Ligand binder design. Structure first.
Ligand SMILES: OC[C@H]1O[C@H](OC[C@H]2O[C@H](OC[C@H]3O[C@H](OC[C@H]4O[C@H](O)[C@H](O)[C@@H](O)[C@@H]4O)[C@H](O)[C@@H](O)[C@@H]3O)[C@H](O)[C@@H](O)[C@@H]2O)[C@H](O)[C@@H](O)[C@@H]1O
Ligand SMILES: [Ca+2]
Ligand SMILES: [Pr+3]
Ligand SMILES: [Pr+3]
Ligand SMILES: [Pr+3]
Length: 1265
C-alpha cells in the first residue's frame, strides 16, 4: 500500500526535486501525495519523472512533468496494448502516450483504426492507431474537420486548395448555406460553393459581408445609395427613419400646484452645500393629508424628493415597482418603454398610499428607510442574476483601480463649482514619504542594504493632508494635548500631572508627509530638552512604524534619530530561521550574514550601532495574517485568496478561526499547521541581543483573543523567565557563532567586559548570559561537541541553567537552589563550556523545534541588576539617542491585541483593560518594562469599513473624534472605549507612573499617534473628485474626472475636536523655548508651520482624498439636458434651476420634430444644449449650441467634429451617434468609433470574433485583401 502523505512541501536539491515530510525528513519509496501517486528513489530521495517503476509488483509509468503516474503504450510487436495509470491493461478506453499520441483500444484490447462513431460525436483514428485532431481528413471524400482538443466532427471553413471552402460536421460542402469558423466568423455561400461579399438579402433581411467574407455587426455606411446601419444582429436598419418617439408630454398636472416646492431656496430643501442628492427631502406647498384632503404644509412637513420627481423615466418606473412591492403602489409592472403620462398617474396613486401610511404610523421614519433601501436595491436581469437597480447611486458606478485596501479611492481637487471645498495653492502634496520628502526619491542606503520605498499617500478612510501648514500645526496641538492629557482633562485633581503620557508611537510613517517627524522631534527638544543628554532623551523613547528599508537611513541622516527606527532585518531573520515549518526554514548560519543592520558576531563597542527597537510579532504584524489564512482554508467559497480573507468582517468566521488558531498553538511543532514554531527560542535571542530595545507583544504571553490577560499561551513560563533574567544577567559585549552542525551560540560577557579576552570589572564576574539555539528537530551531534565561549573573565566558574528542553517542554529554573546537582557545570581555564550528545539533542515539543538552552553564572545576589544608568554628559553628533548600555537597559511592551474581546454594554468594571492594567502594574515592572505601549485610546467607529472599525474589534485605530479618549455622555453616563473611560485611563497611567525602574524613574506610557486618517464622519460636503489608486495615480475613468461627489467628510463641530482643536497653539507661540519649532522651514512644503488658524471642524479642504464611499457617481442630482448640477443655495448660471414642475411652471418632456430640426426636452423640462443624450437605454444623440440635434446630410458627410475638441464622431441622418461601431465614408474608407463614440487613431482594435484591424493616425482603416 502506498502511504498517503498530506503535510509537507517540495524542495530542489542538486537540480532534482525531493519531498519533505511534516516531520522534516525526506521521503523514500512509492508514496501518494495530492491524490496522485509518485515514486521517490531509495538513496538520494529523488522524485521519479518520466521513468518506469514497480509499485507493489505492477509496472507503472510516471509523468515527465509533475512526477505523477500516468498512461503508457509499449509496442513489443503489432499494436502496443496500453495500460491504466495504476498498472493493468485497458479493456476498452482511451490512453494518451508520453509522446502525446492518443489511442483507443477495443474490447479485445487492440487499437481501433478508422472511423469511431460514438454516442452523437463521430471521431477518426488514422492507421497506426493515432487519433487525428486539428486537421481535415477525407474518410471517403468527406473532408471532415476534427477539433484540436477532442476528435469530434465540427463545421469549419478550409482555405486550402482554393479559397473560402466551407465544410460541415457530416462533411458535405455547404453550398448555398451559412457556415461558421472556429473563431466564430460567419460566411455565406451561393450554389456551387463560392462565398459572397457585400450586401446580401437572406430571408427578407439585409446582412453585410466584408471583402474576406465575414458577416458583420455594428457596421454603418452607404450601400447601393442607401445608408444602412447593421446592428448587433448583423441586420440592417434604415438610417433615415428616426429611432425616437416623436411628441412631447406635459408634466403639468392638477397635483403639480400642490406638489410644487414651498420656496426655491435652502429653507425648503435638504441639501449638501446647496446641491441635491437622491436622499433629498423637500417641503411642498401642500400635503395630501391622509391621502384625502389637500392642506397647507407646516414647517415640519418634508417629503422625499423621489416621491414627486425623478432624473429620468428609467428611475421613475423602477421607483413605482419597488414601492408597489412594499405594498403601497398599484399591482402592475412598468418599464422605461412604458409611456410618460402613465408613470405620472401611477406616482400619484403611490403618494395616496404613502400619506395614508404616514397618517397611520404618525411618522415618516419608515419612509426614510424604504427610500434609502430603494436607492441601494437589487433586481433580476435577462441573464437571471442580481444587478443594481440604480447603478448610478451605488459602488458599482465608482469603477477604477483596485489597488487600495478598500478597493478604490478618490483624490480631492479644486473646481469652481464647489468654492468652499477648495484647498490653497501648493497644498495637497501627496506621497511625501521619508524617501520622497523633497519630491524626488533619494536612496540614503549604502552598499549591502536596500534603499527602496513602499510608501503611498492613501491608506484607509478619509486621508488627512499633512503637507498643509495649518494641519501640521493641529498635529502639534494634538501631541501637546496627549503629553498633557491628565492636567487638561482633570484640573480639579492635584495628581493630574501624573496622568500624562510621556512618549509617542508614530503610525503609518510611509503613508503621511515626513515633515511630521521633524515637527515632533522639535517638540520634545523644546518641551523636555531631550537633546541635552542621554538621561533626558531616554526618559522619552519614541518609536517609528517605518517598514520601508530606506527609512532606517533617512531617519539617521535627515531626522537626527528623533524617533527610534525599527529593525526589520532582525525580525525577518528571526521569523525565517525559527518560526516557519521545517520545510520553509532558513539556516541558523543566516544570523551571521552581512545584510543584518547590527553586526553581532563581535559587538565590542558602544555608540556605534544605529539606535533601534526590534521585535518578532505585533498587534498587526504576523497576527491578523495568520487568522486570515485559516478563514481562507475553511471558507474557500467566500474567500479563496489569503488577501481576500483579510477583507472579512463577520464575527462567526473569526470565532471559528480562532478556536482553530488557539487549538493549533497547543499542538506539537511538527503538526503546527498555522502557528509559529520556536517562539521561546526566538525571544531568547531577542532579549539577549546588544544594541537594541526589545519589544514584547502582549499576544505572545497571552492569547490574542478573549478577555484581557485572562488566558496564557504555552510560552508564558519561558518568556517571563527570560524577561526577569534580562534584568539580572544581560550586559556587556556580544558575539554570535554557528558551528558546522548549524548551532547558534549567543554570548554576553557581562558588565565591564566587551570581548572574550577582556578581564572586565568587579561587576563582570556574576553577570553575562549564554544562549544555545538549534532549529533542527533531528539534530544528532554524536562525536562533535557544542561550545559556549564565555569570556576569560568567566574562567574556572560554576554555571547553572536558566532554561532547558525536555520532551515535555521547557524547564525554567528561577534560582540557583532550584537546580539539581547534576546540571551544574564549571568552565575551563579559557572560559569555555563543552556539551555532549548526551546533553544536547534534537527535540520536537510544542515550544521548540531543535534545542534551546540558556546558561547563567552561579551565585548572583538579589540586589544584582545588570542594567546601566543613563549618562548626563553632553553628546556630540546629530543622534538624539545613542545605542549603548543605557539604551539597552530599556524594553518596550506592546500591551494590547486587536482581537481582545470587546466588553459588552453592561460589562463589569474590571473587564475593561485599563482597569486590569492598574491591577497588574507591578507585574510589568518585574519583567523589566521601562515603556508601556498602550493601544490607541480614541473612540472607535463601528461602521465596518475595515477590520479595525467593526464593532467586535474597535481597537481604536479607526476613529472620528481624535480628542475623545473615553469621555462620558452628555447626560453623565459612563461611556468607555474598548479599554475604559478617561478616568479608567488616567488611573492606569498613574499606576504605571507609580512603578519605578532600576534608575528610580517611572515606567513611560506611550500614546499612539495616528496622523494619517479619520473614519466615518457625520456631515456630508460637496467635493470635486478623480478616481485613482492608493498612490494617487489617475485611473482615468472618463466619468470620474473632476465631478461632484457628496462625501461624508465634515466633522460635527460639537465634538471634542471643536473644543480642543488648535487650542494651545497661541499659548505655545508665546513660549520662547518653542521659537525654533515655529521658525523651521519644513522640507516638503518649504514654508513654515502655520499656527494662526485653528481646526475646530474638519472639512474637505484639509484632506488629500478618501477611500470610495459608494454613494454613486450620480448621487448628486443633475439635469441631463443642460448637463448642470442642481443648486438651491446659489443663483449662478453654472448651476441649473429647479425642475420646472417643482416651481409650478409649464413643463414638457420628449423629442419634438420641427421644420428647422429636432429639439429634446428633459424630464425636468429644460432644453438640451451642447450635450450628449441617451434615449430609452439605446441610442445616443448630440445637440448643438442652438439646441438642435446634429444630423448628417448628403452635402455634409457622417464623419463630423461636433464639440470643437478636435474629436471626431460618426453621426447618421437619424442623428444617432454610433458607439462601439465601424463607420464608412462615401469615398470608401472605414473608421472605428470606441465606447465613448469618438474616432480611433494609430491603434489596433480587436474584434469580438478575433479579427484584428489597424487604423492609421489618419483615422482610416488599413485595407486588406
Ligand atoms: O526556486 C526556488 C523554489 O524551489 C521550490 O519549488 C517548488 C515548486 O512548487 C510548486 O510546484 C510543485 C511541483 O514541483 C515539481 O514540478 C515542478 C514543475 O515541473 C514542470 O515544468 C511542470 O510542467 C510543472 O507543471 C511543475 O509545476 C514536482 O515534480 C511536482 O510534483 C510538484 O507538483 C510551484 O508551482 C513551482 O512553481 C515551484 O517550483 C520551492 O518549494 C519553492 O518554495 C522555491 O521558491
Ligand atoms: Ca496620508
Ligand atoms: Pr407645421
Ligand atoms: Pr444603461
Ligand atoms: Pr428601441
Amino acid at each position: 500500500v502506498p502511504e498517503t502523505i498530506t503535510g509537507g512541501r517540495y524542495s530542489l536539491k542538486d537540480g532534482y526535486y525531493v519531498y519533505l515530510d511534516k516531520q522534516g525528513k525526506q521521503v523514500v519509496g512509492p508514496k501518494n501525495i495530492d491524490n496522485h501517486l509518485q515514486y521517490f528513489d531509495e538513496t538520494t530521495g529523488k522524485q521519479v519523472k518520466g521513468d518506469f517503476r514497480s509499485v507493489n509488483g505492477k509496472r507503472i509509468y510516471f509523468n515527465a512533468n509533475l512526477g505523477y503516474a500516468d498512461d503508457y503504450t509499449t509496442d513489443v510487436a503489432g499494436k502496443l496494448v496500453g495500460y491504466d495509470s495504476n498498472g493493468n491493461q485497458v479493456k476498452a478506453g482511451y490512453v494518451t502516450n508520453s509522446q502525446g499520441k492518443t489511442y483507443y483500444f477495443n474490447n479485445q484490447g487492440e487499437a481501433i483504426i478508422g472511423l469511431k462513431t460514438d454516442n452523437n460525436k463521430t471521431q477518426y483514428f488514422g492507421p497506426d492507431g493515432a487519433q487525428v485532431k486539428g486537421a481535415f481528413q477525407q474518410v471517403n471524400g468527406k473532408n471532415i474537420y476534427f477539433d484540436a482538443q477532442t476528435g469530434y466532427a465540427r463545421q469549419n471553413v478550409g482555405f486550402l486548395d482554393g479559397t473560402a471552402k466551407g465544410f460541415d460536421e457530416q462533411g458535405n460542402q455547404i453550398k448555398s448555406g451559412i457556415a461558421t469558423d472556429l473563431s466564430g466568423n460567419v460566411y455565406y455561400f451561393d450554389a456551387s460553393g463560392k462565398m459572397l461579399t457585400g450586401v446580401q438579402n437572406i430571408d427578407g433581411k439585409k446582412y453585410y459581408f466584408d471583402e474576406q467574407g465575414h458577416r458583420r455587426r455594428n457596421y454603418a455606411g452607404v450601400f447601393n445609395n442607401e445608408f444602412i446601419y447593421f446592428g448587433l444582429d448583423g441586420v440592417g436598419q434604415s438610417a433615415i427613419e428616426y429611432q425616437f418617439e416623436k411628441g412631447l408630454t406635459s408634466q403639468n398636472s392638477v397635483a403639480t400646484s400642490h406638489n410644487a416646492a414651498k420656496s426655491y431656496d435652502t429653507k425648503s430643501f435638504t441639501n449638501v452645500d446647496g446641491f441635491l442628492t437622491a436622499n433629498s427631502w423637500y417641503r411642498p406647498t401642500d400635503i395630501l393629508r391622509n391621502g384625502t384632503k389637500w392642506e397647507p404644509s407646516t414647517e415640519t412637513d418634508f417629503r422625499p424628493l423621489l416621491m414627486t420627481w425623478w432624473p429620468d423615466k428609467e428611475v421613475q418606473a423602477n421607483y413605482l415597482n419597488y414601492m408597489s412591492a412594499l405594498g403601497l403602489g398599484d399591482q402592475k409592472i412598468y418599464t422605461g418603454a412604458s409611456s410618460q403620462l402613465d408613470l405620472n398617474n401611477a406616482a400619484l396613486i403611490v403618494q395616496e398610499a404613502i400619506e395614508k401610511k404616514i397618517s397611520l404610523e404618525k411618522s415618516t421614519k419608515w419612509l426614510d428607510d424604504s427610500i434609502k433601501s430603494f436607492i441601494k436595491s437589487k433586481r433580476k436581469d435577462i441573464q437571471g442574476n442580481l444587478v443594481d437597480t440604480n447603478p448610478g447611486w451605488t459602488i458599482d458606478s465608482e469603477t477604477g483601480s483596485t489597488n487600495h485596501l478598500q478597493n478604490g479611492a478618490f483624490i480631492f481637487t479644486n473646481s469652481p463649482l464647489v468654492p468652499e471645498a477648495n484647498a490653497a495653492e501648493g497644498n495637497r502634496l501627496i506621497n511625501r514619504t521619508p524617501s520622497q520628502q523633497t519630491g524626488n526619491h533619494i536612496s540614503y542606503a549604502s552598499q549591502p542594504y536596500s534603499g527602496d520605498d513602499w510608501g503611498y499617500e492613501l491608506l484607509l478612510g478619509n486621508d488627512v493632508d499633512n503637507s498643509n501648514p495649518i494641519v501640521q500645526a493641529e498635529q502639534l496641538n494634538w501631541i501637546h494635548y496627549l503629553m498633557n492629557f491628565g492636567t487638561i482633562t482633570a484640573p480639579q485633581d492635584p495628581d493630574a500631572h501624573l496622568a500624562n503620557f510621556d512618549s509617542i508611537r508614530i503610525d503609518a510613517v510611509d503613508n503621511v508627509d515626513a515633515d511630521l517627524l521633524q515637527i515632533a522631534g522639535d517638540y520634545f527638544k523644546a518641551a523636555y530638552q531631550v537633546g541635552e543628554n542621554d538621561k533626558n532623551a531616554n526618559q522619552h523613547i519614541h518609536i517609528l512604524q517605518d517598514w520601508s528599508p530606506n527609512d532606517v537611513w533617512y531617519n539617521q541622516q535627515v531626522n537626527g534619530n528623533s524617533q527610534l527606527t525599527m529593525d526589520a532585518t532582525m525580525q525577518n531573520q528571526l521569523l525565517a530561521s525559527l518560526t516557519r515549518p521545517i520545510t520553509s526554514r532558513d539556516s541558523m548560519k543566516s544570523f551571521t550574514k552581512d545584510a543584518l543592520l547590527v553586526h553581532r558576531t563581535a559587538d565590542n563597542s558602544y555608540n556605534q550601532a544605529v539606535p533601534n527597537y526590534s521585535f518578532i510579532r505585533a498587534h498587526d504584524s504576523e497576527v491578523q495574517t495568520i487568522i486570515a489564512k485559516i478563514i481562507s482554508d475553511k471558507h474557500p467559497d467566500l474567500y479563496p485568496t489569503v488577501d481576500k480573507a483579510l477583507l472579512a468582517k463577520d464575527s462567526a468566521l473569526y470565532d471559528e478561526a480562532f478556536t482553530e488558531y488557539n487549538a493549533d498553538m497547543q499542538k506539537i511543532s511538527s503538526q503546527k499547521q498555522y502557528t509559529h514554531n520556536n517562539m521561546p527560542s526566538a525571544y531568547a535571542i531577542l532579549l539577549t541581543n546588544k544594541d537594541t530595545v526589545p519589544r514584547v507583544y502582549y499576544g505572545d504571553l497571552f492569547t490574542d483573543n478573549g478577555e484581557y490577560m485572562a488566558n496564557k499561551t504555552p510560552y508564558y513560563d519561558a518568556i517571563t523567565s527570560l524577561l526577569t533574567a534580562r534584568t539580572k544577567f544581560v550586559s556587556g559585549g556580544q558575539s554570535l557563532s554557528v558551528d558546522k552542525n548549524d548551532v547558534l551560540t549567543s554570548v554576553r560577557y557581562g558588565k565591564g567586559a566587551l570581548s572574550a579576552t577582556d578581564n572586565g570589572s568587579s561587576d563582570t564576574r556574576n553577570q553575562g548570559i549564554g544562549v544555545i539555539v538549534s532549529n533542527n528537530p533531528n539534530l544528532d551531534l554524536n562525536n562533535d561537541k557544542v561550545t559556549l565561549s564565555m569570556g576569560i573573565s568567566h574562567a574556572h566558574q560554576a554555571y547553572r541553567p536558566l532554561l532547558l528542553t525536555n520532551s515535555q517542554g521547557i524547564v525554567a529554573y528561577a534560582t540557583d537552589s532550584e537546580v539539581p546537582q547534576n546540571l551544574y557545570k564549571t568552565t575551563n581555564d579559557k572560559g569555555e563550556l563543552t556539551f555532549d550528545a548526551s546533553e544536547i539533542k534534537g527535540y520536537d515539543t510544542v515550544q521548540t523545534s531543535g534545542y534551546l538552552a540558556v546558561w547563567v553564572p552561579v551565585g548572583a545576589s538579589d540586589e544584582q541588576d545588570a542594567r546601566t544608568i543613563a549618562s548626563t554628559e553632553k553628546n556630540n553628533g546629530n543622534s538624539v539617542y545613542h545605542s549603548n548600555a543605557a539604551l539597552d537597559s530599556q524594553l518596550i511592551y506592546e500591551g494590547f491585541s486587536n482581537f481582545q474581546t470587546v466588553p459588552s454594554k453592561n460589562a463589569s468594571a474590571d473587564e475593561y483593560a485599563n482597569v486590569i492594567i492598574a491591577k497588574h502594574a507591578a507585574d510589568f515592572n518585574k519583567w523589566g518594562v521601562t515603556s508601556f505601549q498602550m493601544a490607541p485610546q480614541y473612540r472607535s467607529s463601528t461602521d465596518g469599513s475595515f477590520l479595525d472599525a467593526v464593532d467586535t474589534v474597535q481597537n481604536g485605530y479607526a476613529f472620528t473624534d481624535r480628542y475623545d479618549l473615553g469621555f462620558n455622555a452628555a447626560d453623565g453616563s459612563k461611556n468607555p472605549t474598548k479599554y475604559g473611560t478617561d478616568e479608567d485611563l488616567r488611573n492606569a497611567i498613574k499606576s504605571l507612573h507609580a512603578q519605578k525602574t532600576y534608575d528610580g524613574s517611572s515606567i513611560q506610557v506611550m500614546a499612539d499617534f495616528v496622523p494619517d486618517q479619520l473614519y466615518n464622519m457625520p456631515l456630508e460636503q460637496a467635493v470635486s473628485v478623480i478616481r485613482t489608486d492608493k498612490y494617487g495615480v489617475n485611473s482615468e475613468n472618463p466619468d470620474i474626472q473632476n465631478i461632484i461627489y457628496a462625501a461624508n467628510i465634515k466633522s460635527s463641530g460639537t465634538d471634542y475636536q471643536s473644543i480642543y482643536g488648535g487650542k494651545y497653539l497661541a499659548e505655545l507661540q508665546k513660549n520662547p523655548l518653542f521659537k525654533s519649532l515655529f521658525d523651521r522651514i519644513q522640507i516638503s512644503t518649504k514654508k513654515t508651520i502655520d499656527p494662526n488658524t485653528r481646526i475646530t471642524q474638519w472639512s474637505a479642504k484639509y484632506f488629500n482624498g478618501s477611500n470610495i464611499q459608494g454613494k454613486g457617481i450620480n448621487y448628486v442630482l443633475k439635469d441631463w439636458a443642460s448637463n448642470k448640477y442642481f443648486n438651491v443655495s446659489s443663483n449662478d448660471d453654472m448651476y441649473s434651476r429647479l425642475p420646472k414642475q417643482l416651481m409650478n411652471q409649464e413643463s414638457n418632456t420628449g423629442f419634438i420634430v420641427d421644420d428647422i430640426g429636432v429639439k429634446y426636452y428633459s424630464i425636468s423640462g429644460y432644453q438640451a444644449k451642447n450635450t450628449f443624450v441617451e434615449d430609452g437605454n439605446g441610442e445616443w444623440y448630440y445637440f448643438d449650441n442652438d439646441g438642435y440635434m446634429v444630423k448628417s446630410t448628403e452635402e455634409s458627410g457622417p464623419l463630423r467634429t461636433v464639440n470643437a475638441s478636435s474629436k471626431k464622431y460618426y453621426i447618421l441622418p437619424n442623428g444617432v451617434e454610433i458607439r462601439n461601431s465601424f463607420g464608412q465614408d462615401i469615398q470608401g474608407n472605414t473608421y472605428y468609433f470606441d465606447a465613448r463614440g469618438e474616432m480611433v487613431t494609430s491603434q489596433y482594435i480587436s474584434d469580438d470574433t478575433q479579427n484584428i484591424y489597424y487604423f492609421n493616425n489618419d483615422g482610416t482603416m488599413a485595407k486588406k485583401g
